[PDB]
Design a protein around this ligand. Structure first.
Ligand SMILES: NCc1ccc(C(F)(F)F)cc1
Ligand SMILES: NCc1ccc(C(F)(F)F)cc1
Length: 330
């Protein structure tokens, strides 16, 4: 079987993408953030503290005839930006774009951090990293992808994120009309639970390509591109008036500047990120300083190929027994 769902940016800056997901019987439709950097499916629910809910659609297990409480199970997660949530665990039927999984662990949030409460358009997260990172205790739970793998025509899903436009998550098949040229596959390390791979280098604008190994993770759940300080410094040195601002927390640049493109290597192939993709707009309303989409990973400890990079490509997440990542131009 296969599934296909449209994913839509939540705002004009492509800060995140939401995808409708049907949970329960009868279906309750929630808009979830598909996150290849985590492995928990958690949702705002009728059990969430009422003061921590501001406009989200909530999952109500008591209205689902297929929901079962997973006796004694709890979950607690903390994200790399400081966000967190926790609660109890149900099992229920979950469908994405026509692809149905029965008995999926649905983690019901009793408490959410402030950053989720303020994001009225995100009803939860759907983790698509490896199941070793799932936080359910005492019995670890499988991701939606892991549960669907058996029945999929092919054990893959693909991410086709749009620039200021809707995109597509496909499960079980590779749409050969969605990209140009060939797909270049590269090896994945699963030792930390992430879709971790090694980029073969980079170039700034029309500059020379610098062959150098950059280990990082493919993370649809992270907005920006986080790279080593040496790389990020070489990029922003080409932007007149750009500087690192401690008060803002990263590189900013004059909103009137035009940004160079950024190229990253995948094996022998090259993925080009247009300079417009790196503009994340004024740091405050009316400001003439704009926030950069390429930032240093020094404070984070891991390099992150977030949405800024992934939306420049067609990305195949190949969950075969030897997993690989595929990149193609589009
Ligand atoms: N998108 C989920 C996520 C969040 C944070 C991290 C970090 F910061 F720990 F690398 C990885 C993945
Ligand atoms: N990387 C996971 C993640 C995704 C979204 C959010 C936000 F924006 F909703 F707070 C935080 C963390």
């Amino acid at each position: 079987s296969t599934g296909s769902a449209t994913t839509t940016p939540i705002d004009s800056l492509d800060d995140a993408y939401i995808t409708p997901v049907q949970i329960g019987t009868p279906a309750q439709t929630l808009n979830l953030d598909f996150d290849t950097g985590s492995s928990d499916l958690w949702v705002f629910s009728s059990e969430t503290t009422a003061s921590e809910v501001d406009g989200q659609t909530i999952y109500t297990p008591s209205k689902s005839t297929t929901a079962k409480l997973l006796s004694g199970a709890t979950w607690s997660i903390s994200y790399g930006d400081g966000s967190s949530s926790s609660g109890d665990v149900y099992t229920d039927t979950v469908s994405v774009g026509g692809l149905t999984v029965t008995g999926q662990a649905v983690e019901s949030a009793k408490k959410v951090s402030s950053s989720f409460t303020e994001d009225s358009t995100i009803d939860g997260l759907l983790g698509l990293a490896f199941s070793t990172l799932n936080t359910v205790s005492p019995t670890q739970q499988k991701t939606f992808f892991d549960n669907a793998k058996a029945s999929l025509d092919s054990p893959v899903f693909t991410a086709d994120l749009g620039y200021h436009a809707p995109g597509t998550y496909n499960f079980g098949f590779i749409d050969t009309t969605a990209y140009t040229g060939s797909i270049t596959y590269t090896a994945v390390s699963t030792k930390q639970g992430f879709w971790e791979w090694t980029s073969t280098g980079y170039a700034v604008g029309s500059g020379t390509f610098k062959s150098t190994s950059i280990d990082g993770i493919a993370d649809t759940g992270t907005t920006l591109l986080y790279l080593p300080a040496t790389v990020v410094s070489a990029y922003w040195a080409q932007v007149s008036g750009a500087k690192s601002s401690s008060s803002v927390g990263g590189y900013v640049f004059p909103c009137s500047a035009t940004l160079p493109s950024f190229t990253f290597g995948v094996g022998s192939a090259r993925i080009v990120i247009p300079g417009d993709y790196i503009d994340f707009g004024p740091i405050s309303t009316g400001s003439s300083s704009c926030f950069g989409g390429i930032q240093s990973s020094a404070g984070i400890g891991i390099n992150i190929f977030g949405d800024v990079a992934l939306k420049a490509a067609f990305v195949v997440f190949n969950g075969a027994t030897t997993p690989t990542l595929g990149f193609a131009s589009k």
